[PDB]
Amino acid sequence: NSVSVDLPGSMKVLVSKSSNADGKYDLIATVDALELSGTSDKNNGSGVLEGVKADASKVKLTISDDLGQTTLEVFKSDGSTLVSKKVTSKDKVLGDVKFNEKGEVSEKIITRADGTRLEYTGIKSDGSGKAKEVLKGYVLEGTLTAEKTTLVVKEGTVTLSKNISKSGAVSVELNDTDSSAATKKTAAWNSGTSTLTITVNSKKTKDLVFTSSNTITVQQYDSNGTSLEGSAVEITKLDEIKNALK
């Protein structure tokens, strides 16, 4: 009979134990009560399965040859224009995409392997939109363009801008409208260490590290302004980021 194969994206497919006369394997899957079926020229669970929703929407599940990626698509009833696409890649990152009534990308939610998210909404034909980053304990809000995602935190006269380029590189900057030389914050970004160093009155006050684990840490400098003291503290709420900008 059949063998179960575990799939990325919390799905299972049943593959026939032997091939048919064309050398092909039968595939069966049930995705949220919808039965999908297909035929594959591989034996491991990869290939294409199809079904039809009760509202006549077409559904297709594509499993990559190495079982590393799954793509679950919903189309309009003639199967020609996309409604939604959910892609789990081999790093277990999830891409959740909605399309407008003409099947152009309208909304995209990226769920990282650690569960943090980038939520892109109201996406227009120039790739611009609204953006939100969902971190552990807090949320950052901003905009999207074809060039970058910019998430903004404001505290007093200080604006902190976290940039995620179209390819995923992070840069951070700080602007302060304060004109007093004694209290105005300025800042320098070190991309190599993903660290923003804040300075007040020609002395370093703190390092903000934007880590590869999608967290922010804050570490203070000593009263001189030249060396770090203590240890970095992980931000766990938006208030703590704002406090670092005071």
Side-chain angles (χ1 to χ4, degrees):
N1 258 29
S2 301
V3 47
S4 187
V5 173
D6 188 63
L7 295 178
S10 300
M11 283 178 297
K12 292 189 292 185
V13 59
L14 302 191
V15 200
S16 61
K17 185 140 163 91
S18 310
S19 59
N20 67 19
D22 314 330
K24 302 191 160 185
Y25 286 80
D26 290 325
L27 300 183
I28 288 291
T30 308
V31 181
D32 183 51
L34 183 51
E35 324 290 333
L36 313 176
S37 66
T39 315
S40 178
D41 61 16
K42 295 100 176 174
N43 78 325
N44 63 340
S46 68
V48 172
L49 296 87
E50 294 170 276
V52 192
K53 288 201 170 192
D55 63 8
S57 292
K58 307 291 217 186
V59 178
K60 181 179 278 179
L61 173 62
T62 305
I63 302 144
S64 61
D65 284 350
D66 77 333
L67 307 185
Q69 182 177 105
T70 57
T71 300
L72 181 68
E73 295 169 297
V74 182
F75 303 77
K76 292 289 191 63
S77 58
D78 58 354
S80 59
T81 67
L82 267 178
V83 168
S84 60
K85 180 195 287 204
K86 283 176 204 234
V87 177
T88 307
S89 44
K90 64 182 194 185
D91 54 4
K92 295 315 174 296
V93 174
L94 172 66
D96 216 295
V97 192
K98 299 175 159 46
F99 299 77
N100 58 19
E101 315 267 355
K102 183 169 71 172
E104 315 174 296
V105 165
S106 149
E107 315 271 341
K108 180 193 292 177
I109 299 209
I110 301 170
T111 300
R112 301 196 185 103
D114 62 9
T116 61
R117 312 195 301 268
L118 287 162
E119 304 181 341
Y120 295 115
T121 61
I123 303 173
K124 306 307 169 189
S125 68
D126 63 359
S128 71
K130 280 304 199 187
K132 190 194 278 220
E133 197 173 15
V134 179
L135 292 320
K136 189 145 207 77
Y138 58 99
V139 153
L140 304 176
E141 259 166 18
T143 65
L144 164 78
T145 73
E147 291 184 349
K148 67 184 178 296
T149 301
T150 303
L151 311 155
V152 175
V153 175
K154 289 179 174 300
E155 165 60 38
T157 47
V158 176
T159 302
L160 178 79
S161 285
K162 170 174 171 180
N163 299 301
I164 311 175
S165 86
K166 52 178 165 193
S167 57
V170 177
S171 56
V172 180
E173 50 178 76
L174 188 150
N175 282 268
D176 192 354
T177 63
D178 189 359
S179 308
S180 161
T183 62
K184 172 183 191 213
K185 289 88 193 171
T186 53
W189 175 248
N190 191 324
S191 70
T193 63
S194 202
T195 299
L196 184 83
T197 300
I198 309 185
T199 287
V200 178
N201 196 22
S202 324
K203 314 179 237 52
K204 301 183 181 187
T205 51
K206 50 203 78 175
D207 273 6
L208 292 180
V209 185
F210 296 76
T211 72
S212 63
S213 315
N214 306 298
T215 68
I216 306 166
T217 67
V218 54
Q219 189 176 5
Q220 325 292 318
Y221 283 78
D222 60 25
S223 35
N224 311 141
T226 68
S227 311
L228 296 165
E229 58 166 38
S231 41
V233 176
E234 183 179 294
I235 298 286
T236 65
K237 58 196 208 292
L238 191 72
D239 272 331
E240 294 167 347
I241 298 164
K242 286 177 171 267
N243 287 350
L245 300 182
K246 291 179 177 180

